[PDB]
Amino acid sequence: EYPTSVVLDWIANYFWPYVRISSMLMVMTVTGARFVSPRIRLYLGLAITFAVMPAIPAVPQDIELLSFRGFMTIAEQMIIGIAMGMVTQFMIQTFVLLGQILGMQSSLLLGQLFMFLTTMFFLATDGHLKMLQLVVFSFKTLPIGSGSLNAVDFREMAGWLGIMFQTALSMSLSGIIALLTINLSFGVMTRAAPQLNIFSLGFAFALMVGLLLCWYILAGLYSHYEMFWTVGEAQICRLIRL
Amino acid sequence: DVSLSDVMIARNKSSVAFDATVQIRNKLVEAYKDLMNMPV
Amino acid sequence: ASGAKVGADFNDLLTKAINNVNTLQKASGDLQTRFDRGDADVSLSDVMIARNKSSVAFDATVQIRNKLVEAYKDLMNMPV
Amino acid sequence: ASGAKVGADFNDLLTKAINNVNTLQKASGDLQTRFDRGDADVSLSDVMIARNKSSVAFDATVQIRNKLVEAYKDLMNMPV
Amino acid sequence: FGVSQRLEQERLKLSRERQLAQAIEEMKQVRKARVLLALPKHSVFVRHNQEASASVFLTLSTGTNLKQQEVDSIVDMVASAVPGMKTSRITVTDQHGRLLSSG
Amino acid sequence: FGVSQRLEQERLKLSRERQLAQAIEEMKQVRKARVLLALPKHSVFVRHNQEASASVFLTLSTGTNLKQQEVDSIVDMVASAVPGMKTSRITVTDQHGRLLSSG
Amino acid sequence: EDYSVTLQILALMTMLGFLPAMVILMTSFTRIVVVMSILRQAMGLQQTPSNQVIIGIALFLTFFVMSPVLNEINDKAVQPYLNEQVTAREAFDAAQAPMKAFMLKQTRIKDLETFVTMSGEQVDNPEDVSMAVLIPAFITSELKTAFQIGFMLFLPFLIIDLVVASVLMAMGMMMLSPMIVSLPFKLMLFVLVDGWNLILSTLAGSFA
Amino acid sequence: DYSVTLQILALMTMLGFLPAMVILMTSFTRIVVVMSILRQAMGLQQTPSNQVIIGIALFLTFFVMSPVLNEINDKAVQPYLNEQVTAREAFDAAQAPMKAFMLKQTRIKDLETFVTMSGEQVDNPEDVSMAVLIPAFITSELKTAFQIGFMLFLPFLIIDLVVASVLMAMGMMMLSPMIVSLPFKLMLFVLVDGWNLILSTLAGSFA
DSSP: OOHHHHHHHHHHHHHHHHHHHHHHHHHSTTTTOSSSOHHHHHHHHHHHHHHTGGGSBOOOSSSOSSSHHHHHHHHHHHHHHHHHHHHHHHHHHHHHHHHHHHHHHTTOOHHHHHHHHHHHHHHHTTHHHHHHHHHHHHHHHSOSSSOOOOHHHHHHHHTHHHHHHHHHHHHHHHHHHHHHHHHHHHHHHTOSOTTTOOHHHHHHHHHHHHHHHHHHHHHSHHHHHHHHHHHHHHHHHHHTTO | OOOHHHHHHHHHHHHHHHHHHHHHHHHHHHHHHHHHSSOO | OBHHHHHHHHHHHHHHHHHHHHHHHHHHHHHHHHHHHTOTTOOHHHHHHHHHHHHHHHHHHHHHHHHHHHHHHHHHSSOO | OOHHHHHHHHHHHHHHHHHHHHHHHHHHHHHHHHHHHTOSSOOHHHHHHHHHHHHHHHHHHHHHHHHHHHHHHHHHSSOO | OOOOTHHHHHHHHHHHHHHHHHHHHSSSSEEEEEEEEEOOOOOTTOSOOOOOEEEEEEEEOSSOOOOSHHHHHHHHHHHHHSSSOOTTSEEEEOSSOOOOOOO | OOOOHHHHHHHHHHHHHHHHHHHHHTSSSEEEEEEEEEOOOOOSSTTTOOOOEEEEEEEEOSSOOOOHHHHHHHHHHHHHHSSSOOGGGEEEEOSSOOOOBOO | OOOOHHHHHHHHHHHHHTHHHHHHHTSSHHHHHHHHHHHHHHSSOSSTTOHHHHHHHHHHHHHHHSHHHHHHHIIIIIHHHHTTOSOHHHHHHHHHHHHHHHHHHTOOHHHHHHHHHHHTOOOSOGGGOOHHHHHHHHHHHHHHHHHHHHHHHHHHHHHHHHHHHHHHHHTTOTTSOHHHHHHHHHHHHHHHTTHHHHHHHHHHTTTO | OOOHHHHHHHHHHHHTTHHHHHHHHSTHHHHHHHHHHHHHHSSOSSSSOHHHHHHHHHHHHHHHTHHHHHHHIIIIIHHHHTTSSOHHHHHHHHHHHHHHHHHHTSOHHHHHHHHHHHTOOOSSGGGOOHHHHHHHHHHHHHHHHHHHHHHHHHHHHHHHHHHHHHHHHTTOOSSOHHHHHHHHHHHHHHHTTHHHHHHHHHHHHOO
């Protein structure tokens, strides 16, 4: 044999799967966090790619490492990885949306409270393991050589903003109605004497009830997360055509 | 059946190919990170 | 075909080369000590040939090792 | 299996190598100065063998130090 | 309102059983039918699915018996009624308790 | 509203157990039936996977003795009713307490 | 005549370095982000959608709308170049042209006239104007177009807020802030009409 | 066995992989992440600085993993220096103490996930290959560090919510609560002796 074929193939058979894996990690909720150093994340991507190597099919040998076609392959591996990563960011920020709408309606940082708890939901439900299982499955059903995200995948991923508001409103509709009715009830009941008004007195009353309602929101938030994850996971499988 | 010329050419080709894919990956990621950190 | 087969094939290529270099180094060492102890069946020409090949073989081993480490050091200094 | 016990153990391992290098250098220097001063019962082969050993031993000491210092710098300068 | 996903799914499957039970009421031989379904989820993340199953309890007429034809016809109809759950995974039982199909 | 997921699973189990007991009621030898289920874990490690099981108690007619065909039919219906729970793990007993099936 | 392999690589790496600029100055990224900026500003949420998801959705939206032009570049330029059918110089020109055509489809005649006179050059056809002058005219048209769409998106939310304020004042409660009451109504009406899907149709299809 | 010239080259090469071994095999990963999360918990951004954070982790990862280094020394280093064991056997004799430590500090679920992804048939958890155990170890340690770190975040988030609501109670909607909460965030950490409390639990967390 000529040693060029052996060495080049392994680099092509390792880095190209790694790029998709690494690109998903940098956009992922947990592995792409600001707390972890890039070096720890880099080693994690290297270790995952090495371990899941047997399940990854051999890349086509037609495309050369030093060629413009190989350059396009690197870019389209990232696009697949970022697609999975953005879905995870969409879910967590939707809960951040849920936290801030309650806080805004509470006459008021509350997004961080929901963001941290939703991160715990992601870790406790083994969401990170499922994403890693999804990306290795992507290697099977969406081969590296022939295959990339089409225009329909971009439009479906661009339509997730409506998914955010609809899901965030659905979670908070019961609480937001409660916030409005008590504030309207407080307004009408104290409207008899225009001397009292509310102003800052209304600020104190609104925030106490808003915090209390957030206590109710956290009581039944887990069920909403489970339904939300199913919607997000289905979108991810649609991207990888599984 | 092989010679040092083939080994050295194989080593050089692997080094150039590996250096090519790393830098392009670095350039694309830096482009992605620049887009993410912008004022909306 | 899977990616593990390519990785195993690359691993066997490195193992085969190391064994070939090690075989030459041990072969040169025996011929050196056979001629040095005073055995009359060993020719100085064969000894010099043996240690010439082992020296060249090990020098090739050093070059490949340095390139592997440099690539790894290049790899760890990347945005991720 | 205590922190102080292992810390002493690796210190004992580390100080043993340093003492071994120091022994080779002192022995090399002692052989050189006896031959250089005019002692008749000192062969140039013993002088040359010892000073070649010390050079290799000191070269390993510097190279190992560079690996440790670079490894220390890599862990300290990482972007946490 | 207030029904969450899993519950909704049951409210589907159970209802199907009723109408499938309904489809067995019009048969001359069967007086009453009750279908029990076992439908797991696809669960791509688990490599071992316990697979769907069915078990149907029928109160027949005062008499009558079926040798092999009627039981086979009914098991095929039920199997083709529910997605997946191939025909070999249905157990059929009667008032007298003679085994009619494995699963 | 407000019930946690585990309680939801328990209520589903109660519903399916009740309907299985109702199905066993129509048996001529069976007068009353009570059903208990045992949920699985589905772990790849052999030392940790548990799988499902069942435990059913039958109050038969005043007389009559259950035949082996009867108990096999009952266990087959139970196994096909609920996903998993391979026949090997179903324990069935009677009013007098004689063993009919091991778990 | 054709650039050597070493020089072509240097040009390729250079364009990768300027890749963020090409997205935000030549593609549709600027219009989408500005319009989505208005939508976040119109509703009572200040930073609630967060900057990360807006850019990520904008990037995916651009790849959707730039797919025809990107495929046209792929077919006309990349395919002959990969097959070694054409030289590098003409392949670069064959890739530049679809970008120029797309920027012309999203610009205005007045904007081009201002910059072509500003550059102090001579031209008679808009089709062969230099890309250095087309870029400032393209984004200037994009900013004006985005403000038009954003203004239309801002009106319904202003409509809802004014109605709620009038209702509260008419009921006599001059003490309650309209923003807290109006926010759920703005969000509810944004969801039950599936507002984002409508915005996608009027934004992605606005280029054509 | 490999020649003297080659086996010197082998140890010299892996001498430069020592930072790699620390990050993804020993307790350096969990402590740094917990330290980083707690640093973000207080209003100070880089007051502890990266170098001090690493320096504490390096001292901690030596005290905590001291039993691991003891077994490697007496089972691999000592036999090799006495010529009682060869190069490959000594290297294997060092993997076993470290593979045992990594195996016990991971989650079953993560290992179950990784063996499925690696496509290898292993009947029992204690026989998994090191190629699949290393990614499983760091993945589980990341989850543990995030879960431990964010629980430390909660008391500092409690202070932020209390002070922000109090400021909003008086109508002072423009005063930024973060600058007001910063003095109280530092006080909570020093009153509970935080720098000793987290390290004591982190040291005792491993096995």
